[PDB]
Every structure is written in structure tokens, then in C-alpha cells.
């Protein structure tokens, strides 16, 4: 019974999914966060 | 704003907003540390119970 009980729902594996989602979200926030200007002329160094 | 032109005063207000944001970040980091310690204590209490 436990075999079908695992796959019947989808919230049983919450913790590991939360871990991987947190890691991916942190990475994505970090990569997107460099688009800011921080009160400068532009976010691209070469044009500056 | 009330005494200077925008082009120069905007730099000063940017300095101020950056400082306030950093202070908020420090507060939140302290809160995270305290929450972690409290979580450890709560787990100990749950085991006790």
C-alpha cells in the first residue's frame, strides 16, 4: 500500500523540492540582480 | 529637494536610501540568526515533550 500511497498525492516530497527550489530561486535572483543601475548611468560597464 | 537642484540632490538621496536599505538588511540578518536559534530550542522542547 505504501507504494501507491507515495505516488497518489504530490505533496509527500515537499522538503527536497523546497530545497532545490530555494537554491534555484537564489541563483536566479542573483543573476537578475545585476541589471540594476545603483544610481549610475547604466548597468553595462563597457558603455560607461 | 527644497533647496537644491535635482541633478545633485538625487545623489545625496541615493546615498541615504542605500544606507537605510543596508540597515534594514542588517536587522533582517540578525532576525534570521535569532530565528535559527529559536528553532533549535523549539526542537529541543518538542523532544522533551
* Chain A residues in contact with B10 (beta carbon < 8 A): 39
Q: What angle do CA B29, B32, B37 make, to 5 degrees?
A: 135
B10 CA: distance to closest CA in chain A (Å) = 9
Cell 536566479 identifies what position? A28
Q: How far is CA A41 from CA A22, A34, A37, in A?
A: 32, 14, 7
SS3 A12: coil
Question: Which chain B residue's Cα is nearest to A37?
Answer: B14
The contacts found for B3-6 with CB under 8 angstroms, 24 or more apart, are: none
How determined? cryo-EM
Q: Give me the phi and psi of A47, to 5 degrees please.
A: -65, -40
Distance CA B39, CA B22 (A): 26
Q: What is the resolution of this structure in A?
A: 3.5
* Chain B residues in contact with A39 (beta carbon < 8 A): 10-11, 14, 18
Distance CA B43, CA B28 (A): 22
Distance CA B2, CA A27 (A): 42
Q: What angle do CA B5, B10, B13 make, to 5 degrees?
A: 125
**DSSP code for A43:** S
- CA nearest neighbour of A45 among A34, A30, A29: A34
Amino acid at each position: 500500500k505504501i507504494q501507491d500511497s507515495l505516488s497518489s498525492t504530490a505533496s509527500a516530497l515537499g522538503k527536497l523540492q523546497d530545497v532545490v527550489n530555494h537554491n534555484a530561486q537564489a541563483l536566479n535572483t542573483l543573476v537578475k540582480q545585476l541589471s540594476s543601475k545603483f544610481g549610475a548611468i547604466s548597468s553595462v560597464l563597457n558603455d560607461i | 529637494f527644497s533647496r537644491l537642484d535635482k541633478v545633485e540632490a538625487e545623489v545625496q538621496i541615493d546615498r541615504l536610501i542605500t544606507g537605510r536599505l543596508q540597515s534594514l538588511q542588517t536587522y533582517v540578518t540578525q532576525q534570521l540568526i535569532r530565528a535559527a536559534e529559536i528553532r533549535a530550542s523549539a526542537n529541543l522542547a518538542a523532544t522533551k515533550m
